Design a protein around this ligand. Structure first.
Ligand code: CLA
Ligand code: CLA
Ligand code: CLA
Ligand code: CLA
Ligand code: CLA
Ligand code: CLA
Ligand code: CLA
Ligand code: CLA
Ligand code: LHG
Ligand code: BCR
Ligand code: SF4
Ligand code: SF4
Ligand code: CA
Lengths: 42, 80, 31, 74, 733, 74, 143
């Protein structure tokens, strides 16, 4: 179980998870604020 | 015939002589190292220039060096 | 009497012929 | 070369549309017999003439192929 | 010796075919020949220069003779806009009858070639009118070729060969080359323009048999000495003038107008005469700087040694560079090639925007051909300028004699130079390719309004500062009361503002997002080619992976597979890699130029402005769209005069691809194959009665790289030339 | 697992039944895309009241030669 | 000081079927090589040119076309088998030349009757720059 926690922190798995989460975040941002060319706030 | 030179940083490990495929190199007695040994290159008219000796030397930088020079029949490795 | 009718052939056919036999005989000659 | 030969030959002399009267119109006009024998006919009548579909797919549902064409060249 | 080649004894004792190959490719590297001195090297180079001069004169002799003999000039002078100039005749016995009919144009009586060098416009502009002028010139060039050869011979015997320290007198040579070679020549050219060509474009035919009896100005040489030069510009050609006629002709010989000639869309002749006179004056005065036999002037070495900033930020400054430059020929050659390359692409950029020749701006194919020719030659010259820097660093550089000056300091922080070049080129590549791909995706999904289209507001501002009024910036020369527009309004500003604000010339074309993106691609190319060449130069004396590289020469295959492997580690190999990037960069540049101009010549500028912002646009609307006529040059239904280009197009595609072989396959495979073949031959009957004299061997490693690269770039040039000429000549518009 | 995916996509995101009704007019399609950044343009009119990506693996032909007539079997 | 052996012809050769990898014209006009060894018994071994041969019990004498062939065969014979070998270079004149091992000992073992050839007494980082040897035919490593 500890060995599993180590394995999950090996480079390919760590990067896979990091980028899947990042992808979900950017996807949802663009689903909420679509077609942005400028910063329309201030 | 290529040129092969031995420099005084040699530690006399003999790894270069074991590697030569044409028997160019040789060990000779010395007094400048713990092994009392040094490499020499008495038969450079048979050297094909493979640098198999340089891949084997452990010193930094190298103690055996191969300078490619004028080509002959033996140097090119021609069987015809 | 047509001028290219003579120069195009010999510069195209015989000049390289003589020059190639020339340079072959020269380059394979041991002095 | 094998797949280019098969693709041009099938369109030129096999595939096409037939009419009720029974006159077969092939996808390409049947130009394999006379244009395949030179290299210029392969460059002109096969590559240049049939790449039109993929270089005109931007804006349609075939635009993914137009993107992959260029990505694969890259 | 006792064999070819004589200069190398090591190659002459080579019993394989290598001996021949390398014999040819080492013939002009004089420093590597057996028993070479300093005097022999210098004298060889001097005679070689003379040989090259003879070559150039014989080539231009050939062009003149051939258009005077098989040419079209006389009919072309009568109507420059409605006749195609002939280059020479075709005699080819493999021709069939339809091709014979197809190539017979321009009014000739048989198959011919149309010229695209632009020599009819140039010779017409400077004065030559009938075939006897061209014959005259050709004979004179033959004479000068022979004289060049004679001098080359004369300066190789004893009794006439100069010493090494004659060749090392730098102040002398610079005085003479500045005031003599550049100033006197420009003065005599101003003379030819004032005496022959300015009259030639006003109806009169001044020649050798009458020129001592024709005034160039109404009051010859009066004004010059009384001081009032202004009288020479008192009556210019009116702006309704017809070039080779008297209708609308003036009398001025020197002016400063700025605009173009209205009829020919070309520079005024009086402007060019006045320009050459002005710069000849500048050169003559400036050629009196350095010191010689007369006890005044400057010592270059003293100027170099006195330029060291206190505070020691440049170390020992320039102390000792006179002898580093004076003693190294590769240093001097690198400098020469760098300066010449920059001014070659300056020639390219100025000859299309400010055409000098009459009726050349209306011949589109010659414009495109000249631009591409000069840009590609400039790129090659740049790669050579950088290669001889690495050769200099290996061969002639002396560390102890340059201790702590600017050069050794360059060597001392090579990591900081390479790292920042690397950062710059990474940044440009990432963002340029990223924006292009963004735009392509946006248009594949049908949303061209979602594009990222940055506007080049700085180049638009600089164009406003020159007097363009398309972006409403109202800055210098585009404002109303600024001293810049105020101080020049009388002399050149009328003509300049009239030309720059016209939109059918190429003087400061309008720009938009597409221009921005392609300019950043050009910047990426320049930065990456510089990175490769600079790294190759600064690492040629040794690096960490091979600290003794200087003991191996400029070019060598590798250091074997030890230490991880050392393929392509010489500085020659950095040059070889950089040639690819040079070709790619000049490709981007010339593609940009040709697409912009071909859409402008068709009145369809919006086509470029809309399709240039995504790469599918370039592929479909430029490459694919403009290829139809070329590839239809011959087809199952016949051939037309584009046939020769349709053929050449394919030649270039073939040669190029053959270059891939030598570049992807390497030596061992081929050597084993050849051993097999040698067995086969020696064993077969009636054919083993024949014996080769050199043992056949595969090519060398460096040799294979060179041969591959040569095929690659030959294919490159040939395919692009065929397409460019056929797609402009087919539309002729 | 790859076969499982093919059959599930034929069963769930496909126009196989309508194609079964009129094979020479409906062009087969067993992949649809989400509307995220305008990419829904890739969901093209493949006929039969359906919008997606036309497939070329020839799976409908196999499923018809097999006797499969409902999505429950897939 | 170690007289070298003589070449004893009439020494038999291994049992081979022939192959297209053997001698060629270079052995007729330029040179070829000859290796000899001991072979306690008859055994099979891989020819350094083609397939497999059978070495005979007693002395063995092979003719090859390159020094590298002889030395690769000798390395195989000396490590995988425990066999002593010597090889020679024969000219078209009919002149032999004992080649290896030169002074009776194998070169990876230091023998007290050897001189130094090609030894520089300094590190490799202390060679002069090429500018120091320009126009004179030496090389920077020559020293
Ligand atoms: C470098 C300049 C140059 C070039 C590129 C050409 C090119 C050409 N010439 Mg031309 N020629 C030239 C100079 C040149 N010529 C000069 C100065 C003269 C005398 C005024 C002639 C007289 C001439 C005639 C009479 C004919 C040609 C013909 C031809 C064409 C057929 C090919 C041929 O037969 O070769 C050229 C054949 C010759 C006899 C030329 C001989 C004279 C030159 C000076 C030879 C130079 C060789 C030199 C030793 C090597 C220089 C090194 C470098 C060029 C590689 C060809 C396009 C033929 C043609 O019109 O085809 C339709 C034709 O019959 N030429
Ligand atoms: C289309 C072909 C191509 C491309 C794209 C490149 C690209 C590059 N070359 Mg190169 N080169 C090429 C052909 C090419 N070369 C050829 C034929 C030769 C002759 C052998 C050379 C020889 C050469 C040399 C000698 C050098 C370069 C250098 C460079 C780098 C320059 C820096 C830069 O522009 O930043 C980046 C630009 C890019 C275009 C990178 C594009 C890739 C992006 C990052 C894709 C992103 C991945 C994405 C997330 C999806 C990944 C998919 C997944 C499955 C992994 C760059 C990566 C120089 C260098 O290293 O600079 C430091 C250098 O020294 N090239
Ligand atoms: C250097 C290259 C580059 C650049 C500068 C851009 C820039 C942009 N792209 Mg693009 N793209 C690129 C490459 C690039 N792209 C490539 C190579 C592709 C092909 C894979 C695409 C495909 C693509 C698509 C399909 C789309 C974009 C879109 C966009 C816009 C998104 C704005 C946004 O996300 O809202 C705002 C996002 C944020 C504010 C994130 C920051 C918030 C953080 C996480 C929180 C921090 C709080 C403290 C933006 C201007 C979208 C668009 O709308 O186009 C107009 C979109 O539809 N791009
Ligand atoms: C006034 C005296 C004088 C003059 C006129 C020259 C002239 C020349 N010398 Mg010399 N020299 C001199 C004194 C002089 N030298 C002295 C005193 C010394 C001893 C210190 C030397 C030592 C010396 C050496 C060692 C060498 C020369 C060389 C040369 C030649 C250079 C190559 C060349 O022709 O390119 C032509 C250059 C120009 C025409 C000017 C440059 C033009 C620029 C780059 C651009 C032109 C712009 C314009 C748009 C072009 C129009 C294009 C259109 C027509 C198509 C040249 C003819 C070289 C040589 O002789 O080769 C055999 C060389 O090796 N000189
Ligand atoms: C190196 C170029 C060059 C050369 C060789 C010539 C040569 C000649 N020019 Mg001339 N000219 C030139 C450039 C040149 N020009 C330029 C650039 C201009 C424009 C300013 C003129 C404008 C010009 C005019 C207006 C006239 C000539 C005339 C002449 C002829 C007589 C000169 C004379 O005796 O005056 C006298 C010489 C001197 C008083 C000594 C000159 C002092 C120098 C610097 C020493 C002569 C053949 C005259 C002529 O009648 O032609 C037949 C004539 O009137 N030229
Ligand atoms: C005034 C310009 C100039 C001069 C005087 C020199 C002079 C010299 N260069 Mg240099 N160089 C230059 C410009 C110049 N270069 C440029 C512009 C480049 C960039 C391309 C280079 C790049 C360069 C490199 C990388 C090297 C030199 C080398 C040398 C030295 C020996 C060259 C030699 O004889 O090898 C022999 C000459 C050849 C092998 C040329 C034959 C092969 C060519 C490339 C094929 C031509 C293409 C084809 C035939 C034409 C098309 C085919 C047809 C279908 C149309 C020599 C001192 C070499 C050297 O020895 O180091 C000092 C060296 O390695 N140069
Ligand atoms: C278009 C590029 C190109 C071309 C033309 C070739 C051509 C060839 N390859 Mg190669 N190859 C290439 C790309 C190319 N390759 C690339 C990119 C790679 C890297 C993977 C390889 C890797 C490779 C390998 C590993 C091998 C070959 C082999 C061969 C040879 C095959 C034998 C043969 O067919 O003889 C016939 C020759 C031709 C078909 C060429 C065209 C013939 C022309 C049209 C005849 C014209 C003659 C003309 C009149 C000459 C006179 C002109 C005068 C001015 C002198 C052949 C010469 C194989 C080989 O050597 O076989 C023994 C070999 O094993 N190639
Ligand atoms: C090689 C087989 C294969 C392939 C290439 C695909 C490909 C695809 N499937 Mg699919 N699928 C498959 C097998 C396959 N599937 C199998 C065997 C089943 C079950 C029988 C399904 C059930 C299924 C469903 C229900 C859906 C898809 C969807 C999709 C599309 C969106 C991808 C996605 O999952 O959303 C995004 C990707 C993720 C959220 C990450 C996936 C992580 C999950 C938890 C499983 C992976 C965890 C792993 C074991 C560790 C995509 C084109 C979706 C679709 O068509 O949208 C319209 C959709 O809803 N598939
Ligand atoms: C219009 C004619 C074009 C040629 C003009 C150039 C010649 C004028 C300058 C030459 C200086 C000679 C220097 C001494 C050089 C000299 O004469 O030394 C004689 C030479 C002996 O060589 P060396 O022992 O002197 O070698 C020392 C070298 O380092 C000197 O380069 O013997 C030969 O002649 C070999 C002949 C091979 C010929 C190969 C054929 C090459 C074909 C092309 C040759 C040029 C033609 C170009 C046309 C495209
Ligand atoms: C490696 C090496 C080498 C080589 C180098 C090179 C090749 C360099 C280059 C470079 C380059 C290629 C450069 C360029 C440049 C440029 C510049 C520097 C410029 C400028 C200018 C200006 C500043 C301008 C101004 C103006 C005017 C006048 C008016 C109008 C406006 C303006 C502003 C535009 C040598 C041999 C030396 C040495 C060894 C090492
Ligand atoms: S390069 Fe090869 S043949 Fe030459 S001495 Fe070294 S190991 Fe022996
Ligand atoms: S490998 Fe290097 S250190 Fe060892 S004996 Fe050979 S030369 Fe000396
Ligand atoms: Ca304008």
């Amino acid at each position: 179980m500890r060995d599993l926690k180590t394995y999950l922190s090996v480079a390919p798995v760590a990067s896979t998870l990091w980028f899947a989460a990042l992808a979900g975040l950017l996807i949802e941002i663009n689903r909420f604020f679509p077609d942005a060319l400028t910063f329309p706030f201030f | 015939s290529h040129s092969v030179k031995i420099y005084d940083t040699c530690i006399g490990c003999t790894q270069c002589v074991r590697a030569c495929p044409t028997d160019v190199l040789e060990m000779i007695p010395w007094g400048g190292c713990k092994a009392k040994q040094i490499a020499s290159a008495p038969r450079t008219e048979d050297c094909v220039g493979c640098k198999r000796c340089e891949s084997a030397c452990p010193t930094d930088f190298l103690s055996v060096r191969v300078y490619l020079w004028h080509e002959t029949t033996r140097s090119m490795g021609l069987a015809y | 009497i047509n001028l290219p009718s003579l120069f195009v052939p010999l510069v195209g056919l015989l000049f390289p012929a003589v020059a190639m036999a020339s340079l072959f005989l020269h380059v394979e000659k041991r002095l | 070369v094998v797949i280019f030969h098969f693709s041009w030959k099938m369109q030129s002399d096999v595939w096409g549309s037939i009419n009720d009267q029974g006159v077969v119109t092939h996808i390409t006009g049947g130009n394999f017999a006379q244009s395949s024998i030179t290299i210029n006919g392969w460059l002109r009548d096969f590559l240049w003439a049939q790449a039109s579909q993929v270089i005109q797919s931007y804006g349609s549902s075939l635009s993914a192929y137009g993107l992959f064409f260029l990505g694969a060249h890259f | 010796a006792l064999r070819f080649p004589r200069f190398s004894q090591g190659l002459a004792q080579d019993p394989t075919t290598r001996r021949i190959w390398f014999g040819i490719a080492t013939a002009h590297d004089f420093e590597s020949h057996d028993d070479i001195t300093e005097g022999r090297l210098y004298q060889n180079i001097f005679a070689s220069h003379f040989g090259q001069l003879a070559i150039i004169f014989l080539w231009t002799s050939g062009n003149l003779f051939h258009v005077a003999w098989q040419g079209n000039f006389e009919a072309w002078v009568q109507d420059p806009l409605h006749v195609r100039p002939i280059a020479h005749a075709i005699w080819d016995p493999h021709f069939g009858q339809p091709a014979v009919e197809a190539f017979t144009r321009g009014g000739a009586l048989g198959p011919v070639n149309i010229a695209y060098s632009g020599v009819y416009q140039w010779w017409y502009t400077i004065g030559l009118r009938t075939n006897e002028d061209l014959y005259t010139g050709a004979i004179f060039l033959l004479f000068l070729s022979f004289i060049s050869l004679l001098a080359g011979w004369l300066h190789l015997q004893p009794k006439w060969k100069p010493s090494v320290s004659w060749f090392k007198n730098a102040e002398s040579r610079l005085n003479h080359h500045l005031s003599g070679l550049f100033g006197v020549s420009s003065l005599a050219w101003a003379g030819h323009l004032v005496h022959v060509a300015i009259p030639g474009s006003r109806g009169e035919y001044v020649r050798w048999n009458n020129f001592l009896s024709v005034l160039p100005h109404p009051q010859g040489l009066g004004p010059l000495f009384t001081g009032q030069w202004n009288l020479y510009a008192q009556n210019p050609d009116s702006s309704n003038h017809l070039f080779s006629t008297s209708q609308g002709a003036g009398t001025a010989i020197l002016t400063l107008l700025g605009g173009f000639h209205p009829q020919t869309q070309s520079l005024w002749l009086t402007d060019m005469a006045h320009h050459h006179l002005a710069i000849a004056i500048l050169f003559l005065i400036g050629g009196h700087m350095y010191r010689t036999n007369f006890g005044i002037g400057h010592s270059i070495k003293y100027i170099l040694e006195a330029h060291i900033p206190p505070g020691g930020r440049l170390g020992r400054g320039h102390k000792g560079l006179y002898d580093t430059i004076n003693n190294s020929i590769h240093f001097q050659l690198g400098l020469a090639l760098a300066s010449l390359g920059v001014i070659t692409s300056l020639v390219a950029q100025h000859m299309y925007s400010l055409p000098a020749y009459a009726f050349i701006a209306q011949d589109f194919t010659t414009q495109a051909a000249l631009y591409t020719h000069h840009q590609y030659i400039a790129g090659f010259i740049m790669t050579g300028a950088f290669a001889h820097g690495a050769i200099f660093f290996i061969r002639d550089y002396n560390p102890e004699q340059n201790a702590d000056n600017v050069l050794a300091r360059m060597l001392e922080h090579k990591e900081a130079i390479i790292s920042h070049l690397s950062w710059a080129s990474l940044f440009l590549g990432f963002h340029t390719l990223g924006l292009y791909v963004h735009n392509d995706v946006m248009l594949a999904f049908g949303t061209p309004e979602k594009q990222i289209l940055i506007e080049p507001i700085f180049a638009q501002w600089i164009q406003s500062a020159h007097g363009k009024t398309s972006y409403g910036f109202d800055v210098l020369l585009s404002s109303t009361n600024s001293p810049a527009l105020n101080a020049g309004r009388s002399i050149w500003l009328p003509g300049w503002l009239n030309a720059i604000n016209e939109n059918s010339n190429s003087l400061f074309l309008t720009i938009g997002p597409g221009d921005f993106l392609v300019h950043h691609a050009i910047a990426l190319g320049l930065h990456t080619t510089t990175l490769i060449l600079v790294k190759g130069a600064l690492d040629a004396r040794g690096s960490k992976l091979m600290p003794d590289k200087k003991d191996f020469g400029y070019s060598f295959p590798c250091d074997g597979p030890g230490r991880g492997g050392t393929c392509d580690i010489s500085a020659w190999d950095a040059f070889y890699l950089a040639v690819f990037w040079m070709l790619n960069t000049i490709g981007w540049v010339t593609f940009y130029w040709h697409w912009k101009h071909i859409t402008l010549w068709q009145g369809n500028v919006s086509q470029f402005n809309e399709s240039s912002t995504y790469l599918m646009g370039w592929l479909r609307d430029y490459l694919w769209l403009n290829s139809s006529q070329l590839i239809n040059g011959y087809n199952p239904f016949g051939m037309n005069s584009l046939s020769v280009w349709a053929w050449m197009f394919l030649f270039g595609h073939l040669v190029w691809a053959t270059g891939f072989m030598f570049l992807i396959s390497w030596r061992g495979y081929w050597q084993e194959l050849i051993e097999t073949l040698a067995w086969a031959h020696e064993r077969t009957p009636l054919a083993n009665l024949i014996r080769w004299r050199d043992k056949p061997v595969a090519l060398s490693i460096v040799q294979a790289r060179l041969v591959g690269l040569v095929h690659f770039s030959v294919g490159y040039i040939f395919t692009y030339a065929a397409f460019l000429i056929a797609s402009t000549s087919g539309k002729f518009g | 697992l790859w076969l499982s995916g093919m059959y599930f996509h034929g069963a769930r995101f496909s126009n196989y039944e309508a194609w079964l009704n009129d094979p020479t007019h409906i062009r087969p399609s067993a992949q649809v895309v989400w509307p995220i950044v305008g990419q829904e343009i890739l969901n093209g009119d493949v006929g039969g009241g359906f919008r997606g990506i036309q497939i070329t693996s020839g799976f409908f032909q196999i499923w018809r030669a097999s006797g499969i007539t409902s999505e429950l079997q897939l | 000081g170690f007289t070298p052996p003589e070449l004893d012809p009439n020494t038999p050769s291994p049992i081979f079927g022939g192959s297209t990898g053997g001698l060629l014209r270079k052995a007729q006009v330029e040179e070829f090589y000859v290796i000899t060894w001991e072979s306690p018994k008859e055994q099979i071994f891989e020819m350094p040119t083609g397939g497999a041969a059978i070495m005979r019990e007693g002395p063995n004498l092979l003719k090859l076309a390159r020094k590298e062939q002889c030395l690769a065969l000798g390395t195989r014979l000396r490590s995988k088998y425990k066999i002593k070998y010597q090889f020679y270079r024969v000219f078209p004149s009919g002149e032999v030349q004992y080649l290896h091992p030169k002074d009776g000992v194998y070169p990876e073992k230091v023998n007290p009757g050897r001189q130094g050839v090609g030894v520089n007494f300094r590190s490799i980082g202390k060679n002069v720059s090429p500018i120091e040897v320009k126009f004179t035919g030496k090389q920077p490593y020559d020293l």
